[PDB]
Amino acid sequence: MTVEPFRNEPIETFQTEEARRAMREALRRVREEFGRHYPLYIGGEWVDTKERMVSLNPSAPSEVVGTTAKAGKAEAEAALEAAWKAFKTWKDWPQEDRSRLLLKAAALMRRRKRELEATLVYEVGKNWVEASADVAEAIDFIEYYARAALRYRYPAVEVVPYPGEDNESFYVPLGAGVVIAPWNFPVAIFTGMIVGPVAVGNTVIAKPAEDAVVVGAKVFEIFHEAGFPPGVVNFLPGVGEEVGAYLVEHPRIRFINFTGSLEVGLKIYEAAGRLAPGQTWFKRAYVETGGKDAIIVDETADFDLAAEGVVVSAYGFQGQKCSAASRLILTQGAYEPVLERVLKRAERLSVGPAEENPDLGPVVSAEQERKVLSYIEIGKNEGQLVLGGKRLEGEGYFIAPTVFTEVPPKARIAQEEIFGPVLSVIRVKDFAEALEVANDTPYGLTGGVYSRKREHLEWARREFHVGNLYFNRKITGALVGVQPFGGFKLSGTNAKTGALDYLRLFLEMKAVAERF
Amino acid sequence: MTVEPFRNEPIETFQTEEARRAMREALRRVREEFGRHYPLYIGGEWVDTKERMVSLNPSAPSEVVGTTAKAGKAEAEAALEAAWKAFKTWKDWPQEDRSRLLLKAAALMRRRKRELEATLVYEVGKNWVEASADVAEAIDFIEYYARAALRYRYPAVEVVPYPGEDNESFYVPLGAGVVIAPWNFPVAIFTGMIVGPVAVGNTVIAKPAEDAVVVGAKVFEIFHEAGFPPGVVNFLPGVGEEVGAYLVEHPRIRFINFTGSLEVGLKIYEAAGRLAPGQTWFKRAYVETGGKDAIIVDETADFDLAAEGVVVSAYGFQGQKCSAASRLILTQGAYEPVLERVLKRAERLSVGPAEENPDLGPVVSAEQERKVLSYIEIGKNEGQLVLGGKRLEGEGYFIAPTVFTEVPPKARIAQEEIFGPVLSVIRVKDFAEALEVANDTPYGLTGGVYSRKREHLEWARREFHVGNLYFNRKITGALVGVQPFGGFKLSGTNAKTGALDYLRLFLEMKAVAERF
Numbered sequence A, B: 001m002t003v004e005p006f007r008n009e010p011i012e013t014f015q016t017e018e019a020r021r022a023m024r025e026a027l028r029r030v031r032e033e034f035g036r037h038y039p040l041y042i043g044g045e046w047v048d049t050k051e052r053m054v055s056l057n058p059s060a061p062s063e064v065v066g067t068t069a070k071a072g073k074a075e076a077e078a079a080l081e082a083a084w085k086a087f088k089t090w091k092d093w094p095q096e097d098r099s100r101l102l103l104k105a106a107a108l109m110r111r112r113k114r115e116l117e118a119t120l121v122y123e124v125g126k127n128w129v130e131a132s133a134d135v136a137e138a139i140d141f142i143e144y145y146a147r148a149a150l151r152y153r154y155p156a157v158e159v160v161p162y163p164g165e166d167n168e169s170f171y172v173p174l175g176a177g178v179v180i181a182p183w184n185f186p187v188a189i190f191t192g193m194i195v196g197p198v199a200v201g202n203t204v205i206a207k208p209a210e211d212a213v214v215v216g217a218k219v220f221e222i223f224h225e226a227g228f229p230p231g232v233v234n235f236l237p238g239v240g241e242e243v244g245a246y247l248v249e250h251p252r253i254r255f256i257n258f259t260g261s262l263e264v265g266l267k268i269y270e271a272a273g274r275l276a277p278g279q280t281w282f283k284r285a286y287v288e289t290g291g292k293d294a295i296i297v298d299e300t301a302d303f304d305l306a307a308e309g310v311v312v313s314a315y316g317f318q319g320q321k322c323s324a325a326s327r328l329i330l331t332q333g334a335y336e337p338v339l340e341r342v343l344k345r346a347e348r349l350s351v352g353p354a355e356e357n358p359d360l361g362p363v364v365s366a367e368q369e370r371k372v373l374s375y376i377e378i379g380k381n382e383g384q385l386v387l388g389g390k391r392l393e394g395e396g397y398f399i400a401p402t403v404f405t406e407v408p409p410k411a412r413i414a415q416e417e418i419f420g421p422v423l424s425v426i427r428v429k430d431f432a433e434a435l436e437v438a439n440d441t442p443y444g445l446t447g448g449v450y451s452r453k454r455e456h457l458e459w460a461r462r463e464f465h466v467g468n469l470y471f472n473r474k475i476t477g478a479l480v481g482v483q484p485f486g487g488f489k490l491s492g493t494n495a496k497t498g499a500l501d502y503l504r505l506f507l508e509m510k511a512v513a514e515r516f
């Protein structure tokens, strides 16, 4: 197989009339279909259930955006049978054939990008560019993994020869596994976590987040049209602690690919370490969990550039990103100039229905709203509220961009993942102390430094202990291929997405010697 | 760093007078040294304790080969402090410097090879060639990992460029971890599991098996002479279920590198999945566990070649190998001719004190003897005893080469790892049934096929589900670099030793972007 060198899918900015027209058209088509019901997808067919899952518009939660079937234990068993049956033959496809299937799915996704973006807007409250970035990232994962999988093809392993023998080492896929996905990147991460394992010959049972079941179904429409053989990919919307846990704990689940909260990741990793009755392998579990990400700014920085990057990083998709800047660490010389600029910019941010392309849409659910508001209450006891900190008018879950200052580094709002538009500002003496404060959390996902001082940047390169570090730019929006994505410490297992290393996680090696 | 291409250390056969003379002198000096005491090694110094570990000669267990100090919780804590302190600076050594340190250790081990072989003869009852293979493999691990580590050096990751930015991804070591090692390859596997992680900048607390503490100490003499900085490698002989478990469960242990029984591996993998109080990472655990390994022979095979390779694979080091042929699966046409030849060869095998260079020395301990004899009793009620099945006369733990035939595939002796000189012969119709029987165990470590039929060999290449498969040769003695070693299923986590992929297990990746 020979295709063009990988390039990232351009993120639409909607600066042209044609792009805005195309978006409005997509928004209309999507809302005209709010009545739709999407079944499970098991063994190559759409299979309905008695019970259902309801998905709401977080900008107008009295409005249903769609319903799906609801997978329980019986449907999990059906999916397991289908996935193990498919594995027996899918594992034997030439890599070139599997890679071409991914490339087809990517081409189909690219053709439906406005529809998918519009679905993100209405289902999870992304503004237009956040939605476009999400879909473009999904396309990127498919294009990238299609190509990366060829680097592992039979027989890929470099071994030392021995006289009178052929020695041949090669990779084989593991089996059928479960993918458990979050609501915050429910096209990008959902797609990546499925197609990586699948590309190299695994089969997958995919469990979308409850808040993003409709857009997950639309991704499965693409997989179905692409023509993945029956059982290779399966769609099981349902309750995480029910069907999700059932699959995690199952003796016949070979691996678990999880992205989500630390709370859940901890349970999954623990369960994965147990031998279920009758289980005949050591389960692999990849858990990519939260962050408490900081941007450090020192007195040598471009303060206007820093302020812009901080606001983008803190408030993009309402701060509901594992990569979001939730801490702003300012050295004494940087404190007033940067804080004043951050406040001036943040106070100009618009909040409203996502479809109007505001700076911020709503948080995703009543539960998220409750969590973020509860953290705002905690923060009022720990630091000084200086901006926002309120729900805004309307049924939608609109929360104002929030800033706390004078926040102690060990404060709950400085340690715990709030996952909302809440920035904690911490004053430190110098760069050394900035790094100490940056590192002193249980997490290690993203981080940033604004500074012109070379020695500070290079010191951070060595010592700011996060998996994805950025200098003089935003700390969100890691691009597939460019910035292998994944953290340290309780940010998870360091499964680096959009990197060659990712696919190795879903392979095991056999060594076969013939003495002639 | 530029060195000669890797080559495996030749295994001494002792056919020349020069080799015999050298070995006789080494054995004499080791024997003259019986009763020596070896302290712990923590933070670059030898540290004694009040309690001790006693190491007996299994050929004459009234004889004490040596004693060591005994590590408990306080010593584990001291080692943790030393290893983490050392990690802070060891991780920053240029890879070339760390690799040169390994190469020095290899040169020192090579110069002491006869002494180390002699120590294995007395301490774990290896005959001369089994001892030589063990030490040669240890040297191979050091030489191989020293070179492989350079392939990961800063900045090693292939990434996609982005306009206006430098994007740099690179590997960093994890931290301080624990190595927990078996008695059966107490130089090779002990050395490999330590030096791999250490090569790429980790630090290690090494827990040798109780029955092999003296030879573990001699490996540490080499590490000390080589000049590893204080704290980089630490030696904690002690009780596995005490100090070993303490380290496995500790919130400050970053990774666990384990090779040993399935029973213990299961406990370790489960414990590793738990977040210990105050722990700030997801522990990595590699567990390389047992096997129930089969050789298939069909009617097309060279029966004489097959019988020789079966006898070598089944009885080498008294069957005390994770790779040992404990099952012989014969198609109908192969049954009589191969079994006849196997019995005739096996009944000629000598058994006696390992110093005499017999075909088989003793099993390693009274407990091992008890377990093997117990399995022989079980076997008598499951299959047909046709050779051996007895303890031989003498103080040493001598067990005769044993063969059961017409063994049901689901019999305990056909399923459970006995780890002694006990071969279970299984009669099947054809090659298809041979593969079914071969695959139907909880394990998946080594396997072999003797056949001249190309289609049967290539079928096994695809479907005989073991990590290390060999055609028309013995299934033991995987060579570093040549045959990446490690299994499937309950044979472990497929950490492939003596392969480039091994070192990746002890690294995490950071991605750093600078926008100019």
Ligand SMILES: NC(=O)c1ccc[n+]([C@@H]2O[C@H](COP(=O)([O-])OP(=O)(O)OC[C@H]3O[C@@H](n4cnc5c(N)ncnc54)[C@H](O)[C@@H]3O)[C@@H](O)[C@H]2O)c1
Pocket: A180, A181, A182, A183, A184, A185, A189, A207, A208, A209, A210, A238, A239, A240, A241, A242, A244, A245, A248, A259, A260, A261, A262, A264, A265, A267, A268, A288, A289, A290, A291, A321, A322, A323, A417, A419, A445, A486, A487, A491, A492
């Ligand atoms: N590290 C990363 O790459 C990354 C990326 C995106 C999001 N996240 C994290 O995701 C979190 C937000 O996503 P979320 O709210 O969907 O997380 P969540 O943990 O609540 O749920 C994630 C998924 O797990 C399922 N689930 C819930 N409980 C389960 C259980 N006990 N067993 C099995 N499955 C269960 C849910 O139904 C959902 O599909 C944040 O912490 C964020 O940091 C991390």
Ligand SMILES: NC(=O)c1ccc[n+]([C@@H]2O[C@H](COP(=O)([O-])OP(=O)(O)OC[C@H]3O[C@@H](n4cnc5c(N)ncnc54)[C@H](O)[C@@H]3O)[C@@H](O)[C@H]2O)c1
Pocket: B180, B181, B182, B183, B184, B185, B189, B207, B208, B209, B210, B238, B239, B240, B241, B242, B244, B245, B248, B259, B260, B261, B262, B264, B265, B267, B268, B288, B289, B290, B291, B321, B322, B323, B417, B419, B445, B486, B487, B491, B492
């Ligand atoms: N897969 C492989 O590469 C491979 C290689 C060699 C040996 N083995 C396996 O090793 C076994 C024989 O070795 P062994 O008898 O030394 O095995 P073992 O499991 O009894 O002990 C191995 C090590 O673990 C320690 N240990 C025991 N209990 C522990 C606990 N609860 N927590 C932490 N550590 C503990 C022991 O002290 C020893 O150091 C066989 O099953 C064999 O197949 C596997």
Ligand code: NA
Pocket: A055, A056, A057, A058, A122, A123, A124, A211, A212, A364
């Ligand atoms: Na929704």
Ligand code: NA
Pocket: B055, B056, B057, B058, B065, B122, B123, B124, B211, B212
């Ligand atoms: Na001993």
